[PDB]
Amino acid sequence: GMKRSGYGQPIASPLSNITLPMQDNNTDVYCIRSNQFSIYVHSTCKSSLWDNVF
Amino acid sequence: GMKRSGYGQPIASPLSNITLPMQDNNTDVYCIRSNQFSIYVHSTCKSSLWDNVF
Ligand SMILES: *[C@@H]1O[C@H](CO)[C@@H](O)[C@H](O)[C@H]1NC(C)=O
Ligand SMILES: *[C@@H]1O[C@H](CO)[C@@H](O)[C@H](O)[C@H]1NC(C)=O
Ligand SMILES: *[C@@H]1O[C@H](CO)[C@@H](O)[C@H](O)[C@H]1NC(C)=O
Ligand SMILES: *[C@@H]1O[C@H](CO)[C@@H](O)[C@H](O)[C@H]1NC(C)=O
Protein backbone atom coordinates (compact mmCIF):
# COMPACT_ATOMS: atom_id res chain seq x y z
CA GLY A 1 0.00 0.00 0.00
CA MET A 2 2.19 2.88 -1.28
CA LYS A 3 1.15 6.55 -0.77
CA ARG A 4 2.95 9.95 -0.67
CA SER A 5 4.24 12.67 1.72
CA GLY A 6 4.05 16.49 1.61
CA TYR A 7 7.57 16.64 0.10
CA GLY A 8 6.68 13.65 -2.12
CA GLN A 9 9.01 11.08 -0.48
CA PRO A 10 7.09 7.86 -1.45
CA ILE A 11 6.18 5.85 1.70
CA ALA A 12 5.00 2.21 2.03
CA SER A 13 2.34 1.38 4.68
CA PRO A 14 3.23 -1.01 7.56
CA LEU A 15 -0.43 -1.64 6.77
CA SER A 16 0.51 -3.99 3.94
CA ASN A 17 -0.79 -7.59 3.40
CA ILE A 18 1.27 -10.83 2.98
CA THR A 19 -0.74 -13.81 1.82
CA LEU A 20 0.42 -17.40 2.20
CA PRO A 21 -1.54 -20.31 0.55
CA MET A 22 -4.50 -21.87 2.45
CA GLN A 23 -3.74 -24.74 4.91
CA ASP A 24 -5.77 -26.08 7.90
CA ASN A 25 -8.20 -23.16 7.22
CA ASN A 26 -5.93 -20.62 8.98
CA THR A 27 -3.80 -18.70 6.41
CA ASP A 28 -1.42 -17.14 9.01
CA VAL A 29 0.92 -20.20 8.99
CA TYR A 30 1.55 -22.29 5.82
CA CYS A 31 3.55 -25.51 6.09
CA ILE A 32 5.16 -27.68 3.47
CA ARG A 33 3.96 -31.29 3.70
CA SER A 34 5.46 -32.65 0.49
CA ASN A 35 8.74 -34.22 -0.61
CA GLN A 36 9.59 -31.40 -3.03
CA PHE A 37 8.65 -27.75 -3.23
CA SER A 38 9.10 -24.49 -5.10
CA ILE A 39 8.49 -21.03 -3.59
CA TYR A 40 7.61 -18.00 -5.65
CA VAL A 41 6.98 -14.43 -4.61
CA HIS A 42 4.68 -12.12 -6.51
CA SER A 43 3.43 -8.67 -5.72
CA THR A 44 0.80 -6.15 -6.50
CA CYS A 45 1.42 -2.43 -5.98
CA LYS A 46 -1.61 -0.30 -5.20
CA SER A 47 -1.64 3.35 -4.27
CA SER A 48 -3.81 5.95 -2.67
CA LEU A 49 -4.17 9.68 -2.17
CA TRP A 50 -6.65 9.12 0.63
CA ASP A 51 -5.51 6.84 3.40
CA ASN A 52 -6.50 3.15 3.14
CA VAL A 53 -8.58 3.16 -0.06
CA PHE A 54 -6.12 1.59 -2.57
CA GLY B 1 -7.02 -22.12 27.89
CA MET B 2 -6.94 -25.12 25.50
CA LYS B 3 -9.50 -25.46 22.65
CA ARG B 4 -9.66 -27.31 19.28
CA SER B 5 -9.34 -26.81 15.47
CA GLY B 6 -11.42 -28.09 12.52
CA TYR B 7 -8.94 -30.97 12.01
CA GLY B 8 -8.76 -31.41 15.81
CA GLN B 9 -5.14 -30.24 16.29
CA PRO B 10 -5.38 -29.11 19.99
CA ILE B 11 -4.35 -25.42 20.32
CA ALA B 12 -3.45 -23.41 23.46
CA SER B 13 -4.59 -19.75 23.68
CA PRO B 14 -1.94 -16.96 23.87
CA LEU B 15 -4.88 -15.76 25.97
CA SER B 16 -3.64 -17.75 28.96
CA ASN B 17 -3.06 -16.42 32.54
CA ILE B 18 0.14 -16.61 34.68
CA THR B 19 -0.34 -15.68 38.30
CA LEU B 20 2.50 -14.68 40.62
CA PRO B 21 1.90 -14.21 44.42
CA MET B 22 0.68 -10.79 45.69
CA GLN B 23 3.35 -8.13 46.52
CA ASP B 24 3.07 -4.30 46.76
CA ASN B 25 -0.57 -4.74 45.56
CA ASN B 26 0.51 -5.15 41.89
CA THR B 27 0.68 -8.87 40.94
CA ASP B 28 2.54 -8.30 37.61
CA VAL B 29 6.00 -8.34 39.31
CA TYR B 30 6.76 -10.56 42.36
CA CYS B 31 10.09 -10.16 44.15
CA ILE B 32 11.85 -12.33 46.68
CA ARG B 33 12.70 -10.40 49.85
CA SER B 34 13.82 -13.29 52.06
CA ASN B 35 17.05 -15.14 52.78
CA GLN B 36 15.75 -18.48 51.45
CA PHE B 37 13.11 -19.43 48.93
CA SER B 38 11.40 -22.27 47.10
CA ILE B 39 9.56 -21.89 43.77
CA TYR B 40 6.81 -24.22 42.65
CA VAL B 41 4.78 -24.26 39.48
CA HIS B 42 1.25 -25.58 39.33
CA SER B 43 -1.30 -25.51 36.58
CA THR B 44 -4.94 -25.82 35.80
CA CYS B 45 -6.13 -26.91 32.36
CA LYS B 46 -9.51 -25.61 31.25
CA SER B 47 -11.11 -26.04 27.87
CA SER B 48 -13.81 -24.61 25.70
CA LEU B 49 -15.83 -25.27 22.57
CA TRP B 50 -16.91 -21.65 22.43
CA ASP B 51 -14.14 -19.11 22.52
CA ASN B 52 -13.20 -17.65 25.93
CA VAL B 53 -15.73 -19.38 28.19
CA PHE B 54 -13.54 -22.04 29.90
C1 LIG C 1 -5.13 -5.26 3.59
O1 LIG C 1 -6.38 -5.80 3.97
C2 LIG C 1 -6.91 -4.98 5.00
C3 LIG C 1 -8.04 -5.71 5.69
O2 LIG C 1 -7.43 -6.66 6.56
C4 LIG C 1 -7.34 -3.67 4.35
O3 LIG C 1 -8.05 -2.84 5.28
C5 LIG C 1 -6.08 -2.96 3.90
O4 LIG C 1 -6.46 -1.78 3.20
C6 LIG C 1 -5.26 -3.86 3.00
N1 LIG C 1 -3.96 -3.27 2.85
C7 LIG C 1 -3.35 -3.22 1.67
C8 LIG C 1 -4.05 -3.87 0.53
O5 LIG C 1 -2.29 -2.65 1.55
C1 LIG D 1 1.98 19.70 8.71
O1 LIG D 1 0.87 19.29 9.51
C2 LIG D 1 0.03 20.38 9.89
C3 LIG D 1 -1.08 19.85 10.80
O2 LIG D 1 -1.76 18.78 10.13
C4 LIG D 1 -0.56 21.04 8.66
O3 LIG D 1 -1.35 22.17 9.05
C5 LIG D 1 0.56 21.50 7.73
O4 LIG D 1 0.01 22.02 6.52
C6 LIG D 1 1.46 20.32 7.41
N1 LIG D 1 2.56 20.76 6.57
C7 LIG D 1 3.06 19.98 5.61
C8 LIG D 1 2.12 18.94 5.07
O5 LIG D 1 4.20 20.11 5.21
C1 LIG E 1 -7.78 -15.09 32.00
O1 LIG E 1 -8.46 -14.03 32.66
C2 LIG E 1 -9.05 -13.22 31.65
C3 LIG E 1 -9.45 -11.90 32.27
O2 LIG E 1 -8.26 -11.13 32.40
C4 LIG E 1 -10.22 -14.00 31.07
O3 LIG E 1 -10.99 -13.19 30.17
C5 LIG E 1 -9.63 -15.17 30.31
O4 LIG E 1 -10.71 -15.97 29.84
C6 LIG E 1 -8.73 -15.99 31.22
N1 LIG E 1 -7.98 -16.90 30.39
C7 LIG E 1 -7.80 -18.16 30.73
C8 LIG E 1 -8.34 -18.58 32.06
O5 LIG E 1 -7.22 -18.93 30.00
C1 LIG F 1 -12.95 -22.34 7.09
O1 LIG F 1 -13.47 -21.04 7.38
C2 LIG F 1 -14.61 -20.71 6.59
C3 LIG F 1 -15.05 -19.29 6.93
O2 LIG F 1 -15.25 -19.18 8.34
C4 LIG F 1 -15.74 -21.69 6.87
O3 LIG F 1 -16.86 -21.39 6.03
C5 LIG F 1 -15.27 -23.11 6.60
O4 LIG F 1 -16.29 -24.04 6.97
C6 LIG F 1 -14.01 -23.39 7.41
N1 LIG F 1 -13.53 -24.73 7.12
C7 LIG F 1 -12.97 -25.48 8.06
C8 LIG F 1 -13.37 -25.17 9.47
O5 LIG F 1 -12.19 -26.38 7.79
Side-chain angles (χ1 to χ4, degrees), chain A residues 2 6 8 10 12 14 17-18 20-21 23:
Chain A
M2 302 296 304
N17 296 322
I18 299 172
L20 307 176
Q23 191 191 46

Side-chain angles (χ1 to χ4, degrees), chain B residues 40-42:
Chain B
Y40 299 91
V41 59
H42 299 278

Side-chain angles (χ1 to χ4, degrees), chain B residues 6 10 17 25 30-31 33 41:
Chain B
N17 296 322
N25 245 48
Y30 179 87
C31 297
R33 297 167 179 175
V41 59

Side-chain angles (χ1 to χ4, degrees), chain B residues 19-21 23 25 27 29-33 35-37 39:
Chain B
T19 299
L20 307 176
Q23 191 191 46
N25 245 48
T27 61
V29 175
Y30 179 87
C31 297
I32 298 170
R33 297 167 179 175
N35 295 343
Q36 301 90 39
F37 71 95
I39 301 172

Side-chain angles (χ1 to χ4, degrees), chain B residues 1 13 17 54:
Chain B
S13 61
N17 296 322
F54 302 120

